[PDB]
RNA sequence: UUUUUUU
């Protein structure tokens, strides 16, 4: 039931085509916050149902106003994510759930004809990655200045350096100091760590909300995934690696394998251990490649994508139940961020940490940091 | 390193 927020029939009956009958925690904890046009940063675990908590509450709060919807008109919410790929997936949290507001996707490698129509037409809701974003403001296209609403997922990475600037030039059209006619700040990760609170304040007015679902002395990942680590020269990884994902991932189940570089994921998915079930997704694939690429691994056209970190944070697949990981990152958001690629919304899933000897000290790093403690197989 | 307008 939804008894306890003001969703309407139209929309509750919207949720319902996409399995969505009562609000999860996260949902719950935050959608009068959000609602009623309060600040937040929230923090929740992977796969806990982020998106939502802020898409929901913002449609229903847009539904509520009056929405003359004239041609050209500026948008009244921007969502920014970290790829090309999440902006799509988040973009379809909105535009599933209003038959009204006109919801558009902005992002790189795409024609921009198509974008300048939607211009034309007019937006309600602008989710997108920065750079094309930034790119239509200094065209002259694109007016952010009537923003009511922004939403900073992944905020942890939309505020480190090779975003942070950036995004402050896309904010800084909406954003002036001092002031109470500033958009609502809404800002939602996995990974929320003190030097994003503090960077965070200066974005958001003073009476803001915090809600954090993971607080101190818990496992920073999501519970429902285990987390295994294999010992394995780097020469013998991708072997090892075709064997463990035919024994380890399960009946019509896919399967990620994460590495560090576009080469080695390249490279890997050309290897005979994995290439007749794989393909690559890494920011040297053209864009209409990468898009072919991300769909036919959600509609299992094949089980098996090596990715970088292009696909580890956001994306929400629920047939992965194996994600395996080519050595320990260094930054334990970023092992945080790929194991949560399984274990969503209460499924179980297998982490899977490949480590070479020279390795062991970032594999207990990892351990140390997340709260986790990897069975050695 | 890896994302992220254009190329
Ligand atoms: N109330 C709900 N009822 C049922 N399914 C839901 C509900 N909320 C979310 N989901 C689904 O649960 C999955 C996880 O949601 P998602 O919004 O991607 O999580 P997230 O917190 O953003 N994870 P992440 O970005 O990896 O840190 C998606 O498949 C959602 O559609
Ligand atoms: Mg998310």
């Given at each position: 039931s939804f008894s306890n927020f003001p969703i309407s029939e139209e929309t509750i009956k919207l949720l319902?085509?996409?399995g969505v009958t009562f609000l999860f925690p996260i949902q719950a904890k935050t959608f009068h916050h959000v609602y009623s046009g309060k600040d937040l940063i929230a923090q929740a675990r992977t796969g806990t149902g982020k998106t939502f908590s802020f898409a929901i509450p913002l449609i229903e709060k847009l539904h509520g106003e009056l929405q003359d919807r004239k041609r050209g008109r500026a948008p009244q919410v921007l969502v920014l994510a970290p790829t090309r790929?999440?902006?799509?997936?988040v973009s379809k949290d909105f535009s599933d759930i209003t038959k009204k507001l006109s919801v558009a996707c902005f992002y790189g490698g795409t024609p921009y004809g198509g974008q300048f129509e939607r211009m034309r037409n007019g937006i309600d809701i602008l989710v997108g990655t920065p750079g094309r974003i930034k790119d239509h403001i200094q065209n002259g296209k694109?007016?952010?200045?009537?923003?009511?609403?922004?939403?900073?997922d992944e905020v942890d990475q939309m505020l480190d350096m090779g975003f942070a600037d950036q995004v402050e030039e896309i904010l800084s059209v909406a954003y002036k100091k001092d002031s109470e006619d500033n958009p609502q700040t809404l800002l939602f990760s996995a990974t929320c760590p003190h030097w994003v609170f503090n960077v965070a304040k200066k974005y958001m007015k003073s009476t803001y909300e915090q809600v954090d679902l993971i607080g101190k002395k818990t496992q920073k990942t999501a519970i429902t995934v285990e987390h295994l680590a294999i010992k394995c020269h780097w020469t013998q990884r991708a072997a090892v690696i075709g064997d463990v994902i035919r024994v380890y991932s399960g009946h019509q189940g896919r399967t990620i394998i994460f590495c560090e570089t576009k080469k080695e994921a390249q490279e890997l998915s050309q290897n005979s251990a994995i290439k007749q079930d794989a393909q690559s997704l890494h920011g040297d694939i053209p864009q209409k490649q990468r898009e072919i690429t991300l769909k036919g691994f959600r509609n299992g056209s094949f089980g098996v994508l090596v990715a970088t970190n292009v696909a580890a944070r956001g994306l929400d697949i629920p047939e992965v139940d194996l994600v395996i990981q080519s050595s320990p990152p260094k930054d334990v958001e970023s092992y945080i961020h790929r194991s949560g690629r399984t274990g969503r919304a209460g499924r179980t899933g297998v982490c899977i940490c490949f480590?070479?000897?020279?390795?062991?000290?970032?594999?207990?790093?990892?351990?140390q940091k997340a709260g986790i403690k990897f069975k050695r197989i």
């Open positions: 319902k085509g996409r790929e999440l902006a799509n997936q694109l007016d952010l200045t009537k923003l009511k609403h922004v939403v900073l480590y070479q000897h020279k390795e062991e000290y970032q594999l207990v790093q990892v351990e």
